[PDB]
DNA sequence: AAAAAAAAAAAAAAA
């Protein structure tokens, strides 16, 4: 039978590759969102070459001392998650998971010699993200659920703000296990209050399922829900697919039909590109480029025009006529496409980092390396160096040493212990430790009144003292 | 047989 796997990480920082996880929690459920099996919760021991983001710690309320005492090493941490995730017929999901948690999981698997993507697809698996489901529910089919307005009078979609707005036990927020229930409940609510949409959006979580909607040649208009648009637009707009992204295969170039389409008609590509990557604050008295990408593998909400009803339009302040006009102009002018696609054909302006943790997206691993890395998983730690393997991917050697050094220091010899002590010395430089102490010493002189917040800060200094 | 593109910028979620 098929199942839904709700999960939520509590990390030591925002950057998934560079920051480490602190806590993991997950619950297995059926299609009706009824709890199957026991709830899974466990902590991760942070390595001795990393300090947490003090902000993240003020949010999570979990000190490295607690995680070190309670948790397991990252190799086990990854094993337990990979065990749960690889169960056949499992749809893994959470809240804002595609653009955070899943990025963590991928690195956790990447750092600990597990396949970073297989969990999402292999054995009839998939993933889902409820965030845009809530935005789509509010935008398209709000009747039934209470929607919390912001200070400016705009719709908020923070989990804690939702569960409280619909009478659900949201006491003690930012807790791995407490958030999963709050998510499951939020799903259960939308499933009950609005099934059709919930199903549509579910079945249309698939890369190939979305594809069907895209008729680039005919520029068939589609409803697109995304936070990138804006809460004043119900995070919603009509869009038209101009062309497939020239390099990335999972991306497609969408034109915003609500935006002013003059720049595309007037300016050339080279200038448009520069015009696309400019801030609204420092941008002058010009209309911005009404173009964005949609990553069909990142659970984007797409539907056909008629899904967005003229009522729901008037409710969200979206001019249907203006969208219908620009479409006719875009259909009337092919030359617009030519210039647009060329914007996304340019090569990567950023130089790749030499930090092995951040190289996940430097291509896939081969079958030989993929197999050889399994033998590394099966081979016991102590016997890892004795095993002579000829790897192809230069990342593997650096990944290994870090794996063994972080997870199994006691398996290191003298040289390996020394070069690690150097690696650490390069991380915890006086100027790095000062800036940290400055960041703490600032925050304490800011949250001084909050004894709970201070206690957490002090703990970070006491940790920072005993780690170096 | 299949899986991906971090970071310029749009906004708003997550730690």
From Swiss-Prot:
It comes from the Bacteria. The N-terminal exonuclease domain and the exonuclease C-terminal domain form a central positively charged groove which binds the DNA. Monomer. Interacts with ssb (via C-terminus); this interaction stimulates the exonuclease activity by recruiting the enzyme to its substrate. Changing residue 311 to A: About 2-fold increased ssb-binding. No effect on ssb-dependent nuclease activity. Inhibited by 10 mM EDTA. The gene is sbcB. This is Exodeoxyribonuclease I. Keywords: DNA damage, DNA repair, DNA-binding, Exonuclease, Hydrolase, Magnesium, Metal-binding, Nuclease, Zinc.
